[PDB]
């Protein structure tokens, strides 16, 4: 009822506080409806050269000196971004009512399995059919350019763009998304959850709040809730195939170690 709406609004405020680049801002940028200088477009090797110092990268040497292979430099940029995204999602998850009262080991398991699915949900907010916003909206990397990278790296983003076209077709907003992501985090079917019932209650509660939010915010979109629920399983498949590709990279390309946070997340995952 009224309390469910209050919960939705609390989560939306926490979402705005936790995630600096929202879907609203991203769309403003993607549609050219902002006063800001339009993003630098990386559509090819030369545009990547120029644009490259715009990529949000902090390390021993500048991104240009990390590898002679351009695809490997894109790999390191994406890894750095994903680490910061995991930090962001962790802060949001702690803001979710009831989350900090679960057994800490359950919080860790839920975050582990949930965070990639949440990353792919929010990545769609930064995408259109032609490419993806990077570096807090200061850059735009084309889908074609990503597809032109040598194997294995060439197939990394295509399932994400394909997912994103359908997901964006749902025309969700940030208020919808805050609850959707909270729902994904509190999945009770994650392997190894020790104490399931409190998680199941919170996820149940979030699902009623989500239902009410979509009924109020999208009155003419019939069975939108069902469509959105069906998207979570898709996200799981995306994660599975992504992990297989990552395993290829580990077994194939010389010294391809990952950041310890991502290594921790993928280790013994499923």
């Amino acid at each position: 009822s009224a309390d469910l709406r209050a919960l939705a609004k609390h989560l939306y405020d926490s979402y705005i506080k936790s995630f600096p680049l929202t879907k609203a801002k991203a769309r403003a940028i993607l549609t050219g409806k902002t006063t800001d200088k339009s993003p630098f477009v990386i559509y090819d090797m030369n545009s990547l050269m120029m644009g490259e110092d715009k990529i949000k990268f902090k390390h021993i040497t500048p991104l240009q000196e990390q590898s002679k292979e351009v695809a490997i430099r894109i790999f390191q940029g994406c890894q750095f971004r994903s680490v910061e995204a995991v930090q962001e999602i962790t802060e949001y998850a702690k803001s979710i009512p009831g989350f900090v009262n679960l057994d800490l080991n359950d919080q860790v398991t839920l975050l582990k399995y949930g965070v990639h699915e949440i990353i792919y949900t929010m990545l769609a907010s930064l995408m259109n059919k032609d490419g993806v916003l990077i570096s807090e909206g200061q850059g735009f990397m084309t889908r074609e350019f990503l597809k032109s990278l040598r194997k294995p790296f060439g197939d990394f983003m295509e399932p994400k763009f394909e997912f994103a076209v359908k997901f964006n077709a749902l025309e969700l907003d940030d208020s919808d998304l805050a609850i959707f992501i909270a729902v994904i985090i509190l999945s009770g079917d994650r392997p190894g959850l020790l104490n399931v019932k409190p998680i199941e209650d919170i996820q149940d509660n979030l699902l009623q709040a989500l239902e009410l939010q979509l009924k109020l915010n999208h009155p003419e979109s019939s069975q939108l809730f069902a469509k959105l629920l069906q998207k979570m399983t898709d996200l799981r498949q995306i994660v599975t195939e992504h992990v297989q590709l990552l395993q290829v990279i580990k077994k194939t390309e010389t010294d391809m170690s990952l950041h310890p946070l991502l290594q921790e997340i993928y280790k013994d995952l499923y």
């Binding site: 995991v86 930090q87 962790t90 702690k94 800490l104 860790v108 975050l111 582990k112 921790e264 997340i265």
Partner: peptide, 11 residues
């Protein structure tokens, strides 16, 4: 395991 996630969760 997962010391880094547990530390990220303990602020």
């Amino acid at each position: 395991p997962n010391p880094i996630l547990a530390r990220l969760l303990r602020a």
